[PDB]
């Protein structure tokens, strides 16, 4: 049963939520190999755990940069939630710790690369290809939302492809446990729901909107709202006009009209029927939800894998010296990390 599974999942989550894991490794236990991705203020590096020989992906956050960008509470949210969740399509946090300068989150290394890079290279995914990935996000949001979690940064750049061709969601940077509504302007411009842009107070329905944008971008090769600058993107989003490529199927367009829906009383995922309005939509008719969950469905493609610590599926980045300090920075702000 779904109710039985979710009831057990919530019990599991709450135990870890209430007593988070803390300080479970240290920096000199890893060799830092190569940068896998860099943002405005996070760096993720391929590392090798010396004692086990395992490769991991280590997210490094400069505490001082976190403070300057007013991301303290978000970063605490990020680690507290990621350490507490457990789902087949969520990246696993193995260790976390901090030093004088930085915060560290050590995840399983997902070697297949970002969905983003494959999507840009191939141009677009076929509808069945897009559906395979979309099904996994649907189940993932069902899991997250049941725990009163909002994810808040769905995009191809935060979705990794594993050795079996399945999705691993990374970047819990804006994840938040909230029962009521919330107000923070965060996400990625192309993926923001109108209510975020318009400072209205919003809820988990923004994740469903974001799913609409994701499906569109996967199937079209480009987002439904694009421009050179964020402000121009926001105008298009608030406008609530979406044009679909002529190759889009009738079922796909209908589903997207219901996800990319400005009216919250009408947006799929947010109605009385909740997630089942999406699961039961004609576009997903060929989807076997249990088989997706159990990872028994054949993947559209398997990424190339040359070796245990191969980074071929990732762009190269300029390397930077790790921040180091003789004195502890921002001790009080990150005491719980």
């Amino acid at each position: 049963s779904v109710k039985e599974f979710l009831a057990k999942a919530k019990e599991d989550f709450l135990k870890k939520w209430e007593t988070p894991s803390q300080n479970t490794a240290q920096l000199d236990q890893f060799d830092r190999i190569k940068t896998l991705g860099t943002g405005s203020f996070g760096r993720v590096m391929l590392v090798k755990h010396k004692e086990s020989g395992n490769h991991y992906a280590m997210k490094i956050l400069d505490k001082q940069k976190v403070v300057k960008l007013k991301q303290i509470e978000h970063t605490l949210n990020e680690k507290r939630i990621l350490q507490a969740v457990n789902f087949p399509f969520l990246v696993k946090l193995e260790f976390s710790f901090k030093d004088n300068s930085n915060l560290y989150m050590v995840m399983e290394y997902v070697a297949g690369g970002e969905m983003f890079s494959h999507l840009r290279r191939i141009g677009r995914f076929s509808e069945p290809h897009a559906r395979f990935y979309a099904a996994q996000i649907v189940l993932t949001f069902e899991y997250l939302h049941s725990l009163d979690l909002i994810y808040r940064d769905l995009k191809p750049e935060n979705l990794l492809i594993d050795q079996q061709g399945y999705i691993q969601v990374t970047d819990f940077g804006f994840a938040k446990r909230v029962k009521g509504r919330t107000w923070t302007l965060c996400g990625t411009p192309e993926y923001l729901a109108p209510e975020i842009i318009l400072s209205k107070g919003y809820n988990k329905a923004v994740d469903w909107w974001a799913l609409g944008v994701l499906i569109y971008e996967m199937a079209a090769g480009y987002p439904p709202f694009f421009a050179d600058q964020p402000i121009q993107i926001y105008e298009k989003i608030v406008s609530g006009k979406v044009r679909f490529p002529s190759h889009f199927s009738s079922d796909l367009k209908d589903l997207l009209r219901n996800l990319l829906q400005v009216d919250l009383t009408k947006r799929f995922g947010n109605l009385k029927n909740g997630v089942n309005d999406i699961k039961n939509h004609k576009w997903f008719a060929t989807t076997d939800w249990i088989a997706i969950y159990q990872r028994k469905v054949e993947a559209p493609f398997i990424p190339k894998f040359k070796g245990p610590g191969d980074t071929s599926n990732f762009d190269d980045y300029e390397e930077e010296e790790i921040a180091v300090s003789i004195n502890e920075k921002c001790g009080k702000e990150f005491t719980e990390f």
Binding site: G37, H74, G123, T184, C186, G187, T188, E190, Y222
Partner: peptide, 19 residues
């Protein structure tokens, strides 16, 4: 084409989150 327009735009690379 919309695709050509996108490909010529300034946001075809990895997009950073905003806060």
């Amino acid at each position: 084409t919309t695709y050509a327009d996108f490909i010529a735009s300034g946001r075809t690379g990895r997009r950073n989150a905003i806060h």
